[PDB]
Design a protein around this ligand. Sequence first.
Ligand SMILES: [Mg+2]
Ligand SMILES: [Mg+2]
Ligand SMILES: [Mg+2]
Ligand SMILES: [Mg+2]
Ligand SMILES: [Mg+2]
Ligand SMILES: [Mg+2]
Ligand SMILES: [Mg+2]
Ligand SMILES: [Mg+2]
Ligand SMILES: [Mg+2]
Ligand SMILES: [Mg+2]
Ligand SMILES: [Mg+2]
Ligand SMILES: [Mg+2]
Ligand SMILES: [Mg+2]
Ligand SMILES: [Mg+2]
Ligand SMILES: [Mg+2]
Ligand SMILES: [Mg+2]
Ligand SMILES: [Mg+2]
Ligand SMILES: [Mg+2]
Ligand SMILES: [Mg+2]
Ligand SMILES: [Mg+2]
Ligand SMILES: [Mg+2]
Ligand SMILES: [Mg+2]
Ligand SMILES: [Mg+2]
Ligand SMILES: [Mg+2]
Ligand SMILES: [Mg+2]
Ligand SMILES: [Mg+2]
Ligand SMILES: [Mg+2]
Ligand SMILES: [Mg+2]
Ligand SMILES: [Mg+2]
Ligand SMILES: [Mg+2]
Ligand SMILES: [Mg+2]
Ligand SMILES: [Mg+2]
Ligand SMILES: [Mg+2]
Ligand SMILES: [Mg+2]
Ligand SMILES: [Mg+2]
Ligand SMILES: [Mg+2]
Ligand SMILES: [Mg+2]
Ligand SMILES: [Mg+2]
Ligand SMILES: [Mg+2]
Ligand SMILES: [Mg+2]
Ligand SMILES: [Mg+2]
Ligand SMILES: [Mg+2]
Ligand SMILES: [Mg+2]
Ligand SMILES: [Mg+2]
Ligand SMILES: [Mg+2]
Ligand SMILES: [Mg+2]
Ligand SMILES: [Mg+2]
Ligand SMILES: [Mg+2]
Ligand SMILES: [Mg+2]
Ligand SMILES: [Mg+2]
Ligand SMILES: [Mg+2]
Ligand SMILES: [Mg+2]
Lengths: 203, 260, 141
Amino acid sequence: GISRDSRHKRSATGAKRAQFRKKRKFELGRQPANTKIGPKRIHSVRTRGGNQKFRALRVETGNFSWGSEGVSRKTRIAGVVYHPSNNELVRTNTLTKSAVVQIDATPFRQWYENHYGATLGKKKGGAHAAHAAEVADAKRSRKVERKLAARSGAAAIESAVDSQFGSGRLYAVISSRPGQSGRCDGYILEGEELAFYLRRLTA
Amino acid sequence: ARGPKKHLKRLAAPSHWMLDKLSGTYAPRPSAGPHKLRESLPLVVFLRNRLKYALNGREVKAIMMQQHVQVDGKVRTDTTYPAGFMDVITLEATNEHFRLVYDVKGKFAVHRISAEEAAYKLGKVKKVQLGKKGVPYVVTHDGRTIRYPDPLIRANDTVKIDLATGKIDDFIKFDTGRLVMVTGGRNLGRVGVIVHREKHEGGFDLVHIKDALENTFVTRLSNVFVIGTEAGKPWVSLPKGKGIKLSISEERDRRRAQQG
Amino acid sequence: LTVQSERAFQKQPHIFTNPKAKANKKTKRWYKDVGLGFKTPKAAIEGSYIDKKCPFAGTVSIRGKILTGTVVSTKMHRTIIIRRDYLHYVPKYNRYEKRHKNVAAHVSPAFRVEEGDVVTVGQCRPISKTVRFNVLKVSAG
RNA sequence: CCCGUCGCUACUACCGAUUGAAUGGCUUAGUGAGGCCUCCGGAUUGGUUUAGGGAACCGAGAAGCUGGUCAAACUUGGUCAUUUAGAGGAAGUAAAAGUCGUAACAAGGUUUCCGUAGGUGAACCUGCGGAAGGAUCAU
RNA sequence: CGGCACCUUACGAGAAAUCAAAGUCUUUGGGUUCUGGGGGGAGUAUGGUCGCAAGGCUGAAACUUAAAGGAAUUGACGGAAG
RNA sequence: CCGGUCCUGGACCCAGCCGAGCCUUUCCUUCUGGCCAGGACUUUUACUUUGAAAAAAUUAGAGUGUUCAAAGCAGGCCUUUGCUCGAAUAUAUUAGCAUGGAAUAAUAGAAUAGGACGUUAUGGUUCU
RNA sequence: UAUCUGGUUGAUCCUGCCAGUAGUCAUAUGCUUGUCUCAAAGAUUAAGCCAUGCAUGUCUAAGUAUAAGCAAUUUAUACAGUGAAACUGCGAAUGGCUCAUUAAAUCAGUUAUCGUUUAUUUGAUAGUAUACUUGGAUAACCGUGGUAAUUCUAGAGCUAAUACAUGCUUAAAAUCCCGACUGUUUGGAAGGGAUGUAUUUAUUAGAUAAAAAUUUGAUGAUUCAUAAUAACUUUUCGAAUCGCAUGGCCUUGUGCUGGCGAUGGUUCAUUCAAAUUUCUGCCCUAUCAACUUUCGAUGGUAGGAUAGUGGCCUACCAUGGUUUCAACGGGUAACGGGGAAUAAGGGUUCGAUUCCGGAGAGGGAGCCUGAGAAACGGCUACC
RNA sequence: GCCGUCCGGGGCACGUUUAACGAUCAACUUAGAACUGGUACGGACAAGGGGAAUCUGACUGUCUAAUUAAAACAUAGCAUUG
Ligand SMILES: [Mg+2]
Ligand SMILES: [Mg+2]
Ligand SMILES: [Mg+2]
Ligand SMILES: [Mg+2]
Ligand SMILES: [Mg+2]
Ligand SMILES: [Mg+2]
Ligand SMILES: [Mg+2]
Ligand SMILES: [Mg+2]
Ligand SMILES: [Mg+2]
Ligand SMILES: [Mg+2]
Ligand SMILES: [Mg+2]
Ligand SMILES: [Mg+2]
Ligand SMILES: [Mg+2]
Ligand SMILES: [Mg+2]
Ligand SMILES: [Mg+2]
Ligand SMILES: [Mg+2]
Ligand SMILES: [Mg+2]
Ligand SMILES: [Mg+2]
Ligand SMILES: [Mg+2]
Ligand SMILES: [Mg+2]
Ligand SMILES: [Mg+2]
Ligand SMILES: [Mg+2]
Ligand SMILES: [Mg+2]
Ligand SMILES: [Mg+2]
Ligand SMILES: [Mg+2]
Ligand SMILES: [Mg+2]
Ligand SMILES: [Mg+2]
Ligand SMILES: [Mg+2]
Ligand SMILES: [Mg+2]
Ligand SMILES: [Mg+2]
Ligand SMILES: [Mg+2]
Ligand SMILES: [Mg+2]
Ligand SMILES: [Mg+2]
Ligand SMILES: [Mg+2]
Ligand SMILES: [Mg+2]
Ligand SMILES: [Mg+2]
Ligand SMILES: [Mg+2]
Ligand SMILES: [Mg+2]
Ligand SMILES: [Mg+2]
Ligand SMILES: [Mg+2]
Ligand SMILES: [Mg+2]
Ligand SMILES: [Mg+2]
Ligand SMILES: [Mg+2]
Ligand SMILES: [Mg+2]
Ligand SMILES: [Mg+2]
Ligand SMILES: [Mg+2]
Ligand SMILES: [Mg+2]
Ligand SMILES: [Mg+2]
Ligand SMILES: [Mg+2]
Ligand SMILES: [Mg+2]
Ligand SMILES: [Mg+2]
Ligand SMILES: [Mg+2]
C-alpha cells in the first residue's frame, strides 16, 4: 500500500532505480486522519511492535495551556481560522498540529476572576458592566481578599489577549498531533507569536 | 528476513568454543541472556566439550534437568544458557566451582575455584544513571541492575557482587596502575596494569597496558576489565599462566622442558 | 532578510518568553555547543535566526564522521555542496587516479560561505533526501 | 610468376516492395478486480436497563452503501529490443584451373606507386599534382 | 651561438638494409600525445555525423585461410649497363 | 678481546650498528593539579612506521605414527576409581581508526601591511 | 623447472601467427576398471510443467477434563491416576531450496541511531488515596441435517477457564489548591478537593572561573536521564490464576498467620534481533554526451504518515541536483563476498554451488494474524 | 473681525532610501478547490475526417462568359540568338 521507502524515487543524479524488492511491511504508511470538529470519534490503530495509535476523526474539546499564567484547562474548540500548510484545512475545519484555532474562553476566565478578582474583555456593555461589578462585589473573607491583594500587580495581562475575552473566544495553536495520539491539545497565543498570526488573519 | 534466526551453523560458531568441523551441521545457538552470543559459552559446550561429563547433547540436558547446574548461584535448566566472563558455575554434586575467566590463548579456561571465592563475582560498570522516582542504578557487563550504588561509582569501574543478595560489596575505580584483564580483541586473556589512558572524544578511548614481563600493548577501553586494585593483587584467582603471553618459541621451549 | 518570512511563526521549540516578565524584553534564546572542540559562532548565541537544523541553535546533533571539502555550490537555501578530492589506488599499475565525490551539507545562517571556501562538516541524522552532513567550521579561500 | 571481367558449383553475410511477421521489456490513455481506510447502514443480540400494556434509551454488531488509497489485469497506441520470411539486386570466399586478354614482377617491353577526376569487355587507360619504395646518391 | 646538410668510425644499436640517432633499451623507468596485435573479408556493411555533390570522419561481423610479409644470400633470367 | 667454555653468562677494551639527552643564535604547543590527569590553542594534505581491525572454513604453517597418506584436531602417561600438553602462529589490505617520522611531492602565510609580540604595556567600549 | 619445439625459403636471419606441450574444486564423452579411505552430483538449456507420498507441530506436579475413555479402590461424595477430543498458550517469520531480478543496487570492510521498534532470555521494578473471590457466553460432547464433491459446515440442547468482560481489599504521614469563619498587620483555620503508574500538551529544576563591599547524575555534545507544576485520556495496569508441602500463635474460631515453586504483569536496563545509516570500493559499452524537473527532480517552511529520520507524501515557495575524474542510457550467456584454477614476480580467468549477506516461491498486486511476514507447505484478486 | 487655499519665515518635533508601508480607485484575464446533476456540459449556433503509396505539374497564379480548371498556359530558374 502506502510506502515510505526511498527505492521508488530517482537518485540524486536523476537516474531511475530498478525494482529491488517487493514492498515491505516495515516501511508502510497509512491514511491521514483528517480530524474534524464534531462529537468525539476515535479509532485505535495497531502499530508496529503491538503498540497503539489513536486516530482522532472528530473531537470537540481539548486541553489548552495559558503559558503566562501556568494554568491548563479543558475547553471546546470553535473552529480553525488559520493553517500555515494548506488553506483547505481552514475551509474544511481540519485539525492538525500547528493549526490556529479559536477556543472557548470561559474556563480560563473563570480561573482568572477566581484567582485575581478582576474581569477580562473590558467591554462597557450593560452585561459586561453588571458582571464586572458582580465579580468585584463577590463575598470573600478577609484572608481571601488579602490573598487576592498579594496577587495584584501581576493581574495585568497583555492587551491583545485581554481584548479577545470580549468575544468569548481565544486564539490558540494545536500542539498535539490528533491523528497520532487522539488528543487535540495546544496553548493560547501570546506575545509576538500572537501578533504574527493577528496580521495573517486580518490581512 | 522476516524474523530472528534460531539456528547456528557449525562453521559460523565462535572459534573460542573449539568445536570440530565434522561433528555435525549445527552448533548450539546460545539463548538470549546476560552475555552476548559471540562472547558467551553455552552450558552444553561447557558440560560436554570442556568437562566431558556428558557424552552428547541428550545427556547434558539430563544433567541440567536434575537441578545440578547453577550459574551465579541460581539453578539453570537451559542447555544453551549463555554463561560468560566472570560467571560462576557450581556443580555441588561433584563439589566443584568454576569461574569463566579467559586464559591467555583466548579461550575460556576450565578454572576451578574454592567455595569461598565462588560466593562473589566481579562486574564491569557499563553505565550509571537515574531510574524512575530518581533512584540511581548501575548496569554491569552481565546485564545486572543494582540500585542505590555508591555515589562514587562511575563507568568502567569494577564492582564486587555478593552474588547471593546481588548487592555490591565494594568497588575499584578505573585509574592508572589498576590490574586489568583484556576481554576482547587479539590481546584477549592478557593481564597487566594500566599505564596510560588515551582519550579520543567521539571515538574509542585506548588503554596502554604493561604486562608483568614489561611487555606493553594497546587495546580499546571497551575491552578493558579492571580485576585488581594494583599489580599482583587480583580480586579473583587468575587462571594458570597468569595472563602472560609467551611467544611461540618460548612456548616450544617451555613444552620441551616440561616433558623432558 | 527577515526571520519571519514563512507562513508559520518561526521559533525555537519549547523556548518560552514570558510576556508577563521583567523589563528585559529580550527573546530567550537556546543554543548548545556541539562538542569535539568546535567553537559556537557568536552569530548563533547572539543571533535571531531560527533554524531547526542548525548544529548550534537547532535540535540536530553531530555524531559520526567529520569531513572537509571545498564549496562548489551555494545556490540552495541553507544547503551547500562540497567537493571532496581523493586519490584512488590501482594496484595493478602501482599508481593512483584522481577521483571526487559531491557531498551535500546543511549550512546554518551562523556561517557565511561562498564557492571556493574549505569547510568542515560533521555527520548528523538524515535531514533531507541527500543531506546527512552539517557545516561546523568555515575557512576562507 | 601472375591480374581482372565472363561461365559453372557450394557456402556466408548484406540491400530489398511487403505501412512483412513473431516474441519480450518500458510506457500514454481508457476500463478496472480486490484488499485497506472512511462514510453511513442496522440482519440480530445483550441490557445503562426504565416501564402498567411495555415504551424507551445504552452497548455490541453482519450484509450492504459513500468517498478515498494502493493498485493487479485487460484494450488501444507509441517506443525500445531480440529472432525471422521475401520476388529481385549486389558482393565476398572456397573449388577447378573453363573463356578473353596480358595489367604487375626485368627499363615486364608505355618505369611503378599515391590522391583525385573522367573513360573503358576485363585486367586497365588518360589528365593534373605528388613519391622513389627508380632504371640516377655524380658532371 | 643558431640552422640546412654532409664525410669517417662504430663505443653503441639493429633481422639486416643501415643509423650521431634508429645510441645512452633484460645492466629493462626523464615528460607526454597518437597508433598496431597473423593474412584476407575490409576501410566493406550498418548506424551516426559533416558535405551541394563527389565524398570525408567514425567503423564492425559472418565467413575464410598457414601463411602473408621484412631484410639479406646463391643462382636463373632481363626486349639493362660495361 | 677479555673467557668468566657447561653451545653458554659480566664491567673493562676496540671498532661497527640503532637509539637517546643536553650545548652550540635553536624549532620540539601552552597553563593548573605537582610523566599522569584536568583545561585553552592548533595551515591543509599525500607518503611511510607501529598498533587495533579485516568471522569461521579455505591458504601458508607449529604439534600430533589417522598402520602410511589425503585427512582429522586429536592426543600422551604402568594402565591409572586419574593425572596430564593441546586445539598455536602468520598472511589479508584498498577504505576508515590510533600512532611515530618530517626526506620526497604538494599547500598557506607579513606587500596599499588589515602583519607579529608586549607574559603584568597604557587607556576606552562592551559581554558574563 | 623464471624452459620451449614443428610450420613461409634453393638456403639464411627476422616479424608474426598457426600447431605442438602442461594444469583445471572443469564440464561432457569414449574405451577400460580389482582393493581401502574420502566424496561432488538437474547450476548451465526451461525461476519450464508436475501424478503420488512425506517435509510443523506441541503438555508439565503446576491454564481448562462428568470422554456416557482406560485403570484402581483410595488420604477423599467437588475434583485428585492416566488420558483421546476440544478451548487456551506457543511455534509455524527458523530451517531447507534456488539464483530469476538486481550494476552505487546487492555486497565487503568501516560507522551511526543525541533517529527508532524489539516476543523471548537475564537484572531490577508497583502499599496510592460481592472480596471467604463478579458476570455471560462458546468449543469439545449429545442428536437433527444438507451437498456429487473439500481439512464445508447449519439448526437445537449442555458446560469450563491463565479464553472473554468487569471489579474491591492497605501503611504512615506530608505537600498543593479552593476556602466558610477568625485573628485583625496579614497570621489561625473548619470543610472540600489532588497525589501510584501509563497517555497528551504547556511551563519550570536539570547549576558549576578562583576572594573582596543548601543539594544538583551522565555525555565530546542535547530540549538527555530524572524530578516538579497545571490539566488531559471512548482510562493503560498496581494477580478474581495454578502445583506441591502443610508449619507457627493461641483469643481453639474452619480464627489469625505462612514455605518452596508455575504462570502472568508496568517500566527501565540487558540479550536475541530489526529498520534506516557514514566513508571507500563493482564487468563491457561514446555506433550512449548530456540527464533529472508534467505527474518530486535539488532545497526551505508547515503539516500528514511512520516504530522512528527523511520529498516518504501533501500544501506553499525557491531553481535547483548529476556529468569527459564518464553522468544518463544500453549489454551482461551479472546475485555480492569469504574464496577457486593457474601461477618466478607482476598478473589472467572463474566464483549457480557446504559459510556470511541479499532476493524469490508460476507472474504481478493487496493484506490478515502476530513481537516479528507485504509470509505463499497463510489469505484475497487478476493473468 | 469671520473663515479657508495663494506666497512666505521661527524653532521643539516629525522623512533619510524597512513607502518592504497606508489611503482611495479600477479592466477582465489566468490558475487551483469544494459542491452539484438521469455522466450532462464548444448541450442551439458555429465547426478539419485521417493514414500508407503511385502517376503528374515544383510552388502562389491563369484560360475555353454559355458542356473540358487540367497533367494545359504562365512562372522564377536555365540556355541560345540579334
Ligand atoms: Mg537493466
Ligand atoms: Mg512494548
Ligand atoms: Mg538483514
Ligand atoms: Mg531453548
Ligand atoms: Mg558514541
Ligand atoms: Mg603491479
Ligand atoms: Mg500491414
Ligand atoms: Mg492507467
Ligand atoms: Mg536492447
Ligand atoms: Mg605486361
Ligand atoms: Mg605494350
Ligand atoms: Mg609497364
Ligand atoms: Mg584513355
Ligand atoms: Mg650488434
Ligand atoms: Mg652516416
Ligand atoms: Mg640522419
Ligand atoms: Mg588482423
Ligand atoms: Mg624481398
Ligand atoms: Mg600531585
Ligand atoms: Mg579468516
Ligand atoms: Mg590500512
Ligand atoms: Mg614469403
Ligand atoms: Mg620447402
Ligand atoms: Mg594452442
Ligand atoms: Mg588440455
Ligand atoms: Mg528431477
Ligand atoms: Mg542443487
Ligand atoms: Mg478421568
Ligand atoms: Mg516461548
Ligand atoms: Mg531462510
Ligand atoms: Mg553505466
Ligand atoms: Mg522479566
Ligand atoms: Mg448453541
Ligand atoms: Mg487475558
Ligand atoms: Mg517534517
Ligand atoms: Mg521538506
Ligand atoms: Mg508537491
Ligand atoms: Mg560474478
Ligand atoms: Mg542472472
Ligand atoms: Mg555465489
Ligand atoms: Mg543462471
Ligand atoms: Mg545461502
Ligand atoms: Mg516451477
Ligand atoms: Mg501467485
Ligand atoms: Mg506473496
Ligand atoms: Mg511447496
Ligand atoms: Mg516457507
Ligand atoms: Mg500546377
Ligand atoms: Mg495565399
Ligand atoms: Mg466552359
Ligand atoms: Mg466547368
Ligand atoms: Mg508548362
